Symmetry: C2
Subunit: 437 residues, 2 copies
C-alpha cells in the first residue's frame, strides 16, 4: 500500500497491535536530532507511537514535532500526570520539560533517552527501571560504563534492558547471532571508517564543518579521534566475550574485500595474535555498516561458501552494509514489547573497559573537559589491563580534576585524575563495582 | 567453538539441547543438498537429523560418511520400531523408504532435498498428512502448488515454510525490515554477473559439469534464466510485488546503480511503476539479494544521505550473502522453537512461472526437463498467463507437444499437454479448485 507488500513478520505483528486500538507507547527524553528522528520514524509505522516527549526547554519539543509533521497540531503541553494522561488519551504527543512525568506515566511502555548525555542516560535509565518500565539505551558511552548494573537492576524489576538497534554495536550483534547460531567460529567483528583517525583532532579543526552542517562539533571530533569507535567496539566486546587484541585495537588498513585476510591470526597472514576479537578497519567499502569474519572448520562447508563466491577459505566475511541509527530504534521497541526479546545486553562480567588517553599536557588543578573536545580521547583496553593500570573508565571523566601532571598520550588513571565524585554515573559505577566484587 | 556468549537463536538452541530432546529432522534425499544439511546440523546445538532416506540406500551411508568422516553414525532401519530404536540410540536412521520417515513419531519436521519437484509435492502433502511441519527447499514446486500446501498445513495445525538461505527467502528478510519501518518497496530481487544465454543447453556445459562433478541441469538453468524466473516468482507470490513486464527487465546495473535503474521511468529508471520483482546483470550484487526502497519524508531522506546509504529518494538495501542449504536448519529452529515461518505464499498468487521453447518442436515430441534442451522458464503476471493459456512451468517435464511450437514461443494448453497423472498436476488442479472455491 504505502509499502507495496503484504504484511509479514514484525510488520504484521505491528499491524495486529495497531488493530487492538492500543499502540506501544514510547516515552522519549530529548527533543534534539535523534529524538526528532524517532518522532519522524514512528509516524510512518503502525502500532507504535511516541506517547510523550521531553526537553530541557519546552519550545524544543514543539520544534521537533513541527519538523516531523510540518505543524504543532499533534503536540499538547503537559506538566502534571493528569494532563499528560489526558493528552495521550486525546491522541496527542504530550510535551513537557519534566522527565519525571514521562518516567512515571502509567501509559508509557518503554523509555528512550535521546539527549546524548551519558549522565542523563544513567539517571533516566535507573529511574525508568525503578518505575517498572522497559529501557532502550541509545547512549553507548553510558552502556559501556554502567550497563551491567542497569541490566542487573532491570532483571530485579522484571523489565527488559536493551541497546537500540541501528548503531554499529547492535547491528553487529545481528551478524554475531547468525554466525554463532550456525556454529561457526567468530574470528573478528567490528566496523570500518573510510579515512584514518586523527588522534590530535580538536573543535578548532571542525568548528567550520559543524557550523556548515548545523551540528554538534563534538560529534565530529569524537568520530575523527577514534573515541566513538573505541566505545562501540567495547560494547560489542562486553556483549560477546570478544576482546581487543591489543589496547586501542589494530585498526589496519583494509577494504571490505581484504578483511578476511587481515583481521585473522598472524599465523594465517593476518595481524591478530589470536582469534576472537573486536577490531576495526580503515579503508573503502566497510562503512556504513558492520562485519564478522568467520572461520569454517569442515572442508565441505568451506567448499560450499567458495562455490557460492562468498570468499576464499577458511575465513569469510559477513557484511551488513547499512545501519540506520535512530531510525531502527523503534524495531527494538517492537521486539521488546511484542516478543519480550532484547536486541543487545551486556554480559554480567565485562571483558573490556573504555579508558582514556590525554590529547595534551595538563598540570594539577586543570579540569578535564569532555569527549569530543581538547583534553582526552577514548582508548579500549581489556579489563585486566585497565585494572592493572588503575585506568579511570572514560565515561566518568567529564569535568574531572587533574591531580598529577599528565603528558600528551598518557593514560588517565586514579593516580593522575579524579572524577567528579557526585555524579549519578560515578555513583552508579561504584554500585556496579560492588555488585561485581 | 564460536568464541562468543550464547545470544538469541543460538541461546534458544542451546536451551533446547539442555532438555535432552533435540529438534529432529526427517531428511528425504541424500545428494548434495541433503549432505550439506547433515554436515551443517552436526555443528549446531539442539537440532539433529533423526532419519535420512535415499532412493538407493548406499547414498545415505555416503552422505553420512562425507559429513562425519565415517559411516559409524548410520544405522539401517526397516520398521518403525527399528527406526525409533536407532534414533533413541543416537544414530541417524537410514532407509530407502520415505514413508518410514514421514510417519515416524520422533520426527518433528520434514525436508525434501531431492531437487525433484514431483517428489517435493508428494512428500510435502504426505508430511502434512502425518502432522509434521514442512520446510520446502524445492522452489519450483513451491511456485506451482505452495498455496495448496500452505492451506493444508493450516488445516492440520502445522507450519509450512520455504527454507532460509535461497534468494527468495533471503530477500524476504530485507522486505520484512523495510516494510516494518513503513518504507515503500520499489523493487526487489537478485543479480547475475554475466548476461543470460537463453539458448544454452547441456552441450555447452557438460564438460564443466563433468569437471565439477555436478548436475549439468543446474548450470543450464542458471545461464538460461530459468532459476531466476522461479526465484523472482516466489518473492512475488509472497509479497504482491509483480514482474513489470513478462520475463522482467533484467537491465545492466552494478550494485551501486540499482537505485537509479530499478525505479520508475519518471525518475530515470526502467520501470513503468513501483512495486516489482526484477534482477540486474553486472557486478557486486551476486551472491545475495536487494531491495530498493523509497523515502517519503525529507528528514528521513537526509538521514540516509548523511549515513552515505545513497542519494535519495531511492536507496538500496543489500544482503551480500546467502548460504543455501546451510541456512535451512535456522528455519527449522524458528519453526519448532518459535512457531514462526520464514516464508509462505500468499493465498492468491500474483505471478506464474511459465515457459518458452528453446527450439522448434513438432506434434508428438515430448518436452524434456528444465535445464535441458526444450524449454526455459519465463515469469508472467497471473492475468497475462491466464489470458495466454500458459502452462505452469512446473507441470511440463515429459509433457507432450500437441501443435507445432517455434523457438521463442510460449508453451500453452493449445500447443502442449502436461503429463496428467503426476502428483504435481493433481495437486495443482486441487489448488485451482481451492482458488475458485
Ligand atoms: Mg555509531
Ligand atoms: Mg538460489
Amino acid at each position: 500500500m504505502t509499502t507495496n507488500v503484504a504484511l509479514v513478520g514484525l510488520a504484521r505483528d505491528l499491524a495486529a497491535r495497531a488493530e487492538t486500538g492500543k499502540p506501544i507507547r514510547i516515552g522519549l527524553i530529548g527533543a534534539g536530532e535523534m529524538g526528532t528522528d524517532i518522532v519522524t520514524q514512528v509516524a510512518r509505522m503502525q502500532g507504535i507511537e511516541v506517547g510523550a516527549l521531553s526537553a530541557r526547554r519546552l519550545p524544543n519539543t514543539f520544534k521537533a514535532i513541527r519538523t516531523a509533521y510540518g505543524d504543532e497540531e499533534n503536540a499538547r503541553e503537559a506538566t502534571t500526570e493528569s494532563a499528560m494522561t489526558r493528552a495521550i488519551e486525546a491522541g496527542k504527543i504530550a510535551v513537557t520539560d519534566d522527565n519525571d512525568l514521562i518516567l512515571s506515566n502509567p501509559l508509557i511502555d518503554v523509555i528512550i533517552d535521546a539527549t546524548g548525555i551519558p549522565e542523563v542516560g544513567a539517571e533516566t535509565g535507573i529511574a525508568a527501571i525503578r518505575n517498572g518500565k522497559h529501557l532502550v539505551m541509545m547512549n553507548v558511552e553510558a552502556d559501556v560504563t554502567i550497563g551491567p548494573y542497569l541490566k542487573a537492576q532491570a532483571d530485579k524489576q522484571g523489565v527488559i534492558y536493551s541497546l537500540g538497534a541501528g548503531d554499529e554495536p547492535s547491528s553487529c550483534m545481528e551478524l554475531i547471532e547468525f554466525v554463532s547460531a550456525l556454529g561457526y567460529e567468530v574470528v573478528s567483528a567490528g566496523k570500518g571508517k573510510n579515512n584514518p583517525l586523527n588522534f590530535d583532532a580538536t573543535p578548532d579543526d571542525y568548528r567550520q564543518e559543524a557550523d556548515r552542517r548545523n551540528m554538534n562539533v563534538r560529534l565530529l571530533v569524537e568520530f575523527i579521534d577514534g573515541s566513538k569507535t573505541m566505545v562501540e567496539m567495547a560494547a560489542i566486546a562486553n556483549a560477546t566475550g570478544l576482546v581487543p587484541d591489543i589496547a586501542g585495537m589494530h585498526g589496519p588498513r583494509a577494504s571490505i574485500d581484504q578483511l578476511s585476510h587481515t583481521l585473522i591470526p598472524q599465523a594465517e597472514g593476518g595481524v591478530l595474535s589470536k582469534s576472537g576479537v573486536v577490531d576495526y578497519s580503515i579503508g573503502k567499502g566497510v562503512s556504513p555498516g558492520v562485519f564478522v569474519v568467520a572461520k569454517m572448520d569442515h572442508p565441505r562447508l568451506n567448499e560450499r561458501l567458495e562455490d557460492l563466491k562468498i570468499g576464499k577459505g577458511p575465513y569469510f566475511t559477513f557484511h551488513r552494509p547499512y545501519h540506520l541509527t535512530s531510525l531502527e530504534v523503534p524495531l527494538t521497541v517492537a521486539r521488546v514489547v511484542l516478543h519480550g526479546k532484547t536486541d543487545m545486553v551486556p554480559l554480567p562480567k565485562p571483558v573490556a573497559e573504555v579508558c582514556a588517553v590525554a590529547k595534551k599536557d595538563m598540570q594539577p588543578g586543570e579540569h578535564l573537559d569532555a569527549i569530543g573536545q581538547y583534553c582526552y580521547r577514548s582508548w579500549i583496553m581489556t579489563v585486566p589491563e585497565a585494572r592493572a593500570a588503575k585506568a579511570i573508565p572514560c565515561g566518568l571523566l567529564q569535568n574531572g580534576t587533574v591531580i598529577a601532571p599528565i603528558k600528551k598520550g598518557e593514560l588517565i588513571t586514579y593516580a593522575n585524575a579524579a572524577p567528579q565524585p557526585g555524579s549519578r554515573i560515578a555513583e552508579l559505577r561504584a554500585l556496579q563495582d560492588a555488585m561485581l566484587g
